[PDB]
Amino acid sequence: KVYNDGYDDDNYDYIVKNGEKWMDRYEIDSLIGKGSFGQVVKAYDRVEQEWVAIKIIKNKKAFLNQAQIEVRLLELMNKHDTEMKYYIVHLKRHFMFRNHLCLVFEMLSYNLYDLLRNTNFRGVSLNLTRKFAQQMCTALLFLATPELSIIHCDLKPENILLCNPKRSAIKIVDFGSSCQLGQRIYQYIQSRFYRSPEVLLGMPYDLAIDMWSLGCILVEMHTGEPLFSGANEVDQMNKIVEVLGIPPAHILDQAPKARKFFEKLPDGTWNLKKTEYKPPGTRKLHNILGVETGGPGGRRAGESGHTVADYLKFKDLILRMLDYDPKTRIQPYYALQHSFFKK
Numbered sequence: 001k002v003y004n005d006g007y008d009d010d011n012y013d014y015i016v017k018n019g020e021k022w023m024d025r026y027e028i029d030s031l032i033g034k035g036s037f038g039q040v041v042k043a044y045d046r047v048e049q050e051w052v053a054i055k056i057i058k059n060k061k062a063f064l065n066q067a068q069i070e071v072r073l074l075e076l077m078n079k080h081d082t083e084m085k086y087y088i089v090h091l092k093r094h095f096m097f098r099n100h101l102c103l104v105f106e107m108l109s110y111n112l113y114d115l116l117r118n119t120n121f122r123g124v125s126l127n128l129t130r131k132f133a134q135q136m137c138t139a140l141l142f143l144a145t146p147e148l149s150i151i152h153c154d155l156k157p158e159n160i161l162l163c164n165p166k167r168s169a170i171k172i173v174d175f176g177s178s179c180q181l182g183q184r185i186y187q188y189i190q191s192r193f194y195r196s197p198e199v200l201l202g203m204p205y206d207l208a209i210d211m212w213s214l215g216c217i218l219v220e221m222h223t224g225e226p227l228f229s230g231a232n233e234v235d236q237m238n239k240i241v242e243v244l245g246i247p248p249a250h251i252l253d254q255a256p257k258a259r260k261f262f263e264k265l266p267d268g269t270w271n272l273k274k275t276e277y278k279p280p281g282t283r284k285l286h287n288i289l290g291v292e293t294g295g296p297g298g299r300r301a302g303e304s305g306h307t308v309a310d311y312l313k314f315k316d317l318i319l320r321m322l323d324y325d326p327k328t329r330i331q332p333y334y335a336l337q338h339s340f341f342k343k
């Protein structure tokens, strides 16, 4: 069996060969990423004299269409004045090559998960976390401009990359799962650890689900561990409940999947159901962040910029992002005015 004249493997992926050169322009270096969409390779652009990252989409109509949506949104974004657009990875161009759709992006550095692995999952300082947070909020602000109304849908450490391994500037990548504010066709979305309550509950969702994700990410950048690391949806909701309590009644009364996690008592109130979890609301974020005990594992005592005052402003911003009600969950514009960023 031969695939795409020998260029593809059985998984519809282009067989990457180091040193090969395409269209007498790009010189392939090495594979730097895999995913259900296909692969990501580091290449050198002879014409522009620069390094670029090329995303080679699998040779399958299903994935090809997924990518065309990504191209559309990217082109739509990169057609907007503001410098806010500079927190979104830039698509230089795209072309079909040997039946594969290729997207050429500016070359970037490590993703934040890699960064967390180098701290051996102990986290980065509160000051570095603040820099990331401010950029992330500005990116979400940009995705929220009316004409765009883009929901990334897959924010997580792996999709936030540093521009330069020395500087702290970051960029959001991978809009393959993104959509514009529209109609809840799909329901099983976002990576589990960062899945918002409304998605878990099967309710309508909008741009707010990205802010919930951000909150989970910030806490994880600082503590070094996922705030809610469920092994499945039920375990995921229970871990969320340990920290924020039972969701408000008005929300559960409309949750199509509420009875998958809770039970409505004969009196109208809700409680966790059957089946290792501290009581609702007993696992305070105050303690998780170590506000009064020198940060996570007390490993931040004496470190400049880690006073109780600082930690409080951080605990506050996070709680405003992890609000159960998507209607009152803090939006990008105001998060940026929060006293946590106040100089």
Ligand SMILES: COc1ccc2c(c1)[nH]c1c(C)nccc12
Residues within 6 Å of the ligand: 032, 033, 035, 040, 053, 055, 089, 105, 106, 107, 108, 109, 161, 173, 174, 175
């Ligand atoms: C290592 O540098 C990059 C630059 C752009 C992207 C990248 C890695 N990974 C991407 C993915 C998974 N999607 C769109 C753009 C990129």
